Amino acid sequence: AKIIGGFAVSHTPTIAFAHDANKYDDPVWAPIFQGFEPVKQWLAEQKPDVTFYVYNDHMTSFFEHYSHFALGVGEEYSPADEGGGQRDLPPIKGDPELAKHIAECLVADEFDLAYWQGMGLDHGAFSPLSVLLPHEHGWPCRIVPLQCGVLQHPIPKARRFWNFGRSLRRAIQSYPRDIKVAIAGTGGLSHQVHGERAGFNNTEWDMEFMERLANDPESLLGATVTDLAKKGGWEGAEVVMWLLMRGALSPEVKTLHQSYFLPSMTAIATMLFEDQGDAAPPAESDEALRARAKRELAGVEEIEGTYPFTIDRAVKGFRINHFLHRLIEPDFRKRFVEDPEGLFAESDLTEEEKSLIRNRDWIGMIHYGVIFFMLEKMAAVLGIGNIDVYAAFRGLSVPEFQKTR
Amino acid sequence: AKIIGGFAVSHTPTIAFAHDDPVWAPIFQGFEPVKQWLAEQKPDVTFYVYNDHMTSFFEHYSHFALGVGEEYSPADEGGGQRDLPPIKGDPELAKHIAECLVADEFDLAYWQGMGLDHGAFSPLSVLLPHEHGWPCRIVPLQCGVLQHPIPKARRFWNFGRSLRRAIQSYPRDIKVAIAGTGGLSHQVHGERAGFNNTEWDMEFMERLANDPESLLGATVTDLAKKGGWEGAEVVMWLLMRGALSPEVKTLHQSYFLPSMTAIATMLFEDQGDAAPPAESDEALRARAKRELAGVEEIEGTYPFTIDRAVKGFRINHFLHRLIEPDFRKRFVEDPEGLFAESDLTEEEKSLIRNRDWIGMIHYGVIFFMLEKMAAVLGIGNIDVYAAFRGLSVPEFQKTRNAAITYS
Numbered sequence: 008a009k010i011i012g013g014f015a016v017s018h019t020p021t022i023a024f025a026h027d028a029n030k031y032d033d034p035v036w037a038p039i040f041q042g043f044e045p046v047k048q049w050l051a052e053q054k055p056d057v058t059f060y061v062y063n064d065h066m067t068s069f070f071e072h073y074s075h076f077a078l079g080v081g082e083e084y085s086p087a088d089e090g091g092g093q094r095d096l097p098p099i100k101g102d103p104e105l106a107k108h109i110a111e112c113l114v115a116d117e118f119d120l121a122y123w124q125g126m127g128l129d130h131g132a133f134s135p136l137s138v139l140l141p142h143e144h145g146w147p148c149r150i151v152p153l154q155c156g157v158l159q160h161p162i163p164k165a166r167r168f169w170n171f172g173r174s175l176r177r178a179i180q181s182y183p184r185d186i187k188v189a190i191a192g193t194g195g196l197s198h199q200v201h202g203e204r205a206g207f208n209n210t211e212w213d214m215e216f217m218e219r220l221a222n223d224p225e226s227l228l229g230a231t232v233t234d235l236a237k238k239g240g241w242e243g244a245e246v247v248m249w250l251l252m253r254g255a256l257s258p259e260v261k262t263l264h265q266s267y268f269l270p271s272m273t274a275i276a277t278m279l280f281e282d283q284g285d286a287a288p289p290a291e292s293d294e295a296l297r298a299r300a301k302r303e304l305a306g307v308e309e310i311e312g313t314y315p316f317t318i319d320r321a322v323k324g325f326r327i328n329h330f331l332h333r334l335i336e337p338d339f340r341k342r343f344v345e346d347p348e349g350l351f352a353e354s355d356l357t358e359e360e361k362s363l364i365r366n367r368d369w370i371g372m373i374h375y376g377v378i379f380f381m382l383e384k385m386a387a388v389l390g391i392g393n394i395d396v397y398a399a400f401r402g403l404s405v406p407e408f409q410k411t412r
Numbered sequence: 413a414k415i416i417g418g419f420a421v422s423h424t425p426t427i428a429f430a431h432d433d434p435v436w437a438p439i440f441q442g443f444e445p446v447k448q449w450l451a452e453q454k455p456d457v458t459f460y461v462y463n464d465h466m467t468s469f470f471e472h473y474s475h476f477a478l479g480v481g482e483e484y485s486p487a488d489e490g491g492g493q494r495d496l497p498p499i500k501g502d503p504e505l506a507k508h509i510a511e512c513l514v515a516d517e518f519d520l521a522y523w524q525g526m527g528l529d530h531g532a533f534s535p536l537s538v539l540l541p542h543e544h545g546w547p548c549r550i551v552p553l554q555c556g557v558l559q560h561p562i563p564k565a566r567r568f569w570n571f572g573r574s575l576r577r578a579i580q581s582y583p584r585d586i587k588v589a590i591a592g593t594g595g596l597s598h599q600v601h602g603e604r605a606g607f608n609n610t611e612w613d614m615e616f617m618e619r620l621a622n623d624p625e626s627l628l629g630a631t632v633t634d635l636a637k638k639g640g641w642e643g644a645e646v647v648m649w650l651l652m653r654g655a656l657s658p659e660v661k662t663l664h665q666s667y668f669l670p671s672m673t674a675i676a677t678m679l680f681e682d683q684g685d686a687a688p689p690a691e692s693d694e695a696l697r698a699r700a701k702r703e704l705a706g707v708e709e710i711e712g713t714y715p716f717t718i719d720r721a722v723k724g725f726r727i728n729h730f731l732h733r734l735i736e737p738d739f740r741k742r743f744v745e746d747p748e749g750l751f752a753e754s755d756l757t758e759e760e761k762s763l764i765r766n767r768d769w770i771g772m773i774h775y776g777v778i779f780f781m782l783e784k785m786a787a788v789l790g791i792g793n794i795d796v797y798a799a800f801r802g803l804s805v806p807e808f809q810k811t812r813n814a815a816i817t818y819s
C-alpha cells in the first residue's frame with residue numbers, strides 16, 4: 008500500500024557484462040559503478056518488499072507473440088538464455104497477489120493487459136538488477152515485472168504510458184497490505200543500436216529529458232515516436248517506460264540522485280526519486296477503488312460448481328496446466344500414453360498433481376485449479392470422449408447424465 | 413474500406429471434430445443462411461473475432477491479440493494437425509487497424525505463425541468453401557476471455573466501435589466481413605457443467621441486434637450466471653456488433669441446442685452510417701500515422717513496424733532459436749544441415765552465411781536477433797555496430813568515448 012519512491016536506470020547488457028567480468032576496479036567502468044551507489048544504498052536501507060519492475064524484453068522471451076503491457080504474475084523468475092547461456096544468478100521471487108490486485112484495478116481502468124509466467128528475464132531486467140541488489144543467493148526483494156512492447160510499432164502513445172503509471176500508483180496504493188513498494192523504469196537513455204545511424208547519442212537531449220521527467224513530466228506527454236527517436240535514437244525512444252514509472256509517483260518528487268555516463272553506445276543514466284505522498288486525498292478512495300476493482304466478480308462466489316480461472320488459480324495451477332498443455336506436441340502426447348511414469352518422473356509436477364492426472368480425476372483437477380480446455384486436451388488425447396468428463400463432473404455417468412434433451 | 417456486415421456463430425469444437433444425421437440437419441443449414449451471404453457478397457477479408465482455448469495462447473496470454481501474418485495453419489489441439497488448407501491473412505489491413513486502435517488508446521498484442529484452433533477453424537469449414545483454399549483473407553482478433561481479470565463488456569464494445577471506423581478508413585476500397593464468433597449459453601466445467609439458459613439466450617440475441625447498448629453493464633457475474641461461465645465469452649459478440657451500424661437488418665437467425673452448447677447464429681447486414689462520423693476518414697488516417705509521421709527523415713534508421721516484422725519473420729524466427737543451446741550448437745557445427753531443414757529462402761540463407769550485418773537490417777531482421785547471432789559466434793556487439801557504419805572496429809571504437817567490448 009506504500010510506494011516509497013522510484014528509480015530509473017539504463018538496462019544495457021554492458022552493465023551486466025562489466026559486472027560479471029568484475030571490472031568494478033577497471034578505470035573506465037569504476038566511476039560508472041559509483042553512479043549506481045546511491046540507488047543501491049537507498050534500496051538496501053528502505054528495504055522495499057517488492058519492486059514493480061518496468062523493462063522491455065529484447066526479442067528473447069517475447070517475439071512470435073508480442074504484447075504492449077505484459078504483467079508477470081508467476082511466483083518465480085530465472086535469467087533468460089540470450090544465446091550465450093543463462094547468467095549465474097538465483098531466480099527472483101514474484102508476487103502473484105500484488106500482480107493480481109494490480110491486474111484488477113488496471114482492467115477496471117480500461118487498460119488491456121497480458122499475463123505471463125514461466126518465462127525468463129533477459130538483460131532488460133537482470134542487467135541493472137544484478138548491480139542494484141545483492142544476490143549472492145537471495146534477492147532482497149520480490150518483483151512484479153511489467154514487460155513493455157516497445158520494439159514493434161505501432162506501440163502505445165507516450166501519454167498512454169504516463170496514464171498507465173497513474174492508474175498503477177493507485178492500484179499499488181490501494182493494495183490492502185502493509186508493504187513498501189519501489190518502482191523501476193529501466194532502459195534508455197539516448198542510443199541507437201541499428202542501421203548506419205548506429206552510434207547516435209545526444210547528451211543535450213538526455214539531460215533535458217531527465218530534468219523534465221523529474222520536475223515537469225506532463226510536458227513530455229505530447230512526444231511522438233518520431234520526436235523521441237530523432238532526439239534520442241530509435242531504441243532511445245524506449246524511455247517511455249521511464250514516463251510510466253514516473254506516472255506511478257507523486258506529482259512532485261525529491262530527486263535524490265542523478266548520474267550520467269556515455270562510454271560506448273549507450274548513455275548510461277540513473278535517477279533516484281523519493282516519493283512525497285499524496286497532498287490532497289485522491290478523487291477515488293482506497294476502499295472505493297478496491298470495490299470497483301472486483302466489481303466484475305462481485306457475487307461470483309455464490310455460484311457453486313464454478314471455479315473461475317483468475318490469476319491466483321492460474322498461478323496455483325501453472326505447473327499442471329503447462330504439463331497438460333504440452334499435449335499439443337506430438338512426442339509428448341505419445342509418451343503421455345507410452346510412458347506416463349517416465350513423463351511423470353522427468354516432470355516438476357508435485358506427486359499430488361501426478362495422481363490427479365493418473366486417476367483421470369476430472370472435477371478433482373477442476374477443483375485443484377486445472378483449466379478445462381487442458382482437460383479437453385487430455386480426454387481427446389487419452390481417447391476419452393469429452394462428455395465422459397462432463398458426466399464425471401456432475402457425479403453421474405455417461406448414460407444417466409446424457410438425459411437432458 | 414466498406415464493411416458488408418457481421419455474422420455471429422458458435423465455435424463449439426464438435427461442430428467440426430466429428431462432423432467432417434436427423435438431429436444436426438436443422439442447424440447444419442441453419443448455418444447456410446449466412447453461408448449464402450458469404451458466397452454472394454464475397455468479402456475480400458473477414459475480420460474474425462474468436463478466442464483461443466488455451467492451445468496457442470497460454471504461458472503468455474493477452475486480451476486483444478491481433479494476427480498480423482500472411483498464412484494461418486490449423487492449430488494441433490492434441491487431436492493432431494487437422495487437414496485443412498492454410499488460409500491467407502491480411503498484414504496490410506492488420507497493420508492499418510493496429511494504428512487506429514493504438515491511436516484510440518487500445519493496448520494490443522501482435523502475433524504470427526501460430527495455429528488457429530477450433531475457435532476459428534471449426535466453424536469456418538462450415539461457413540466457407542474450403543476446397544483448395546478459402547474465399548477470403550482473414551484478420552484474426554484472438555481475444556483473451558478465459559483468465560480474469562479480462563476487459564469489460566463496455567471495453568469489448570468500444571473496441572468494435574473503434575474497429576469499425578478503423579476498417580472504414582482503410583484507403584483500399586475492398587469489402588470486409590466481421591465475424592463475432594463465440595457462445596452461446598453453456599458451461600463446460602465444475603458441476604454446473606451442463607448449465608444452459610435460453611430465456612436469456614433469446615433475450616440476448618434480440619437485444620444484441622436491436623438494443624445492444626443495454627448490454628453494456630453486464631458484469632462477468634450477471635453474464636456467467638445467466639449463461640454459464642464459458643457462456644460469458646459472448647462479449648466477443650458485442651465487439652462484433654460494435655463494428656456495425658447502430659441500426660441493422662437481421663437477415664437470418666438460427667438456433668437449436670443439442671448437447672452442451674447453445675449453437676446460435678445471427679446474420680447482420682450493415683446499413684449506412686447514422687450521421688457522418690465526427691472525424692473524417694482522412695483525418696483518421698492522419699491521426700493513425702501521426703506517431704511515426706516523418707520518421708523517413710531519420711537516416712540510417714529502419715523502424716520495426718508490422719510490415720517489417722511480417723517481411724522479416726522467417727529469418728527473424730529462425731535467428732530467434734539461437735536462444736536454444738541445441739539449435740545454436742548445430743548452427744555453429746553443421747550450419748548447412750540446419751539451412752536445408754529450415755524454411756529460409758536462398759537469400760535469407762546467404763545473409764546469415766555471409767555474416768551480412770547491414771544487409772540483415774535492411775532486409776527486416778531486427779537488431780536483437782543479430783545481437784544473439786554475434787554472441788553465438790563468439791564475436792560481439794561492437795563488430796556489428798562497426799559493420800553497420802562500414803568502419804573497421806578500431807576506427808569505430810574511435811567514435812566512442814571509451815573502448816569496451818561485450819556480448
Ligand SMILES: O=C(O)c1cc(O)c(O)c(O)c1
Nearest residue numbers: 018019020021200272273793
Ligand atoms: O550495446 C549497447 O550498449 C546496448 C545493447 C542493447 O541490446 C540494449 O538494449 C541497450 O540498451 C544497449
Ligand SMILES: [Fe+3]
Nearest residue numbers: 063131194245
Ligand atoms: Fe531495451
Ligand SMILES: [Fe+3]
Nearest residue numbers: 463594595645
Ligand atoms: Fe470459447
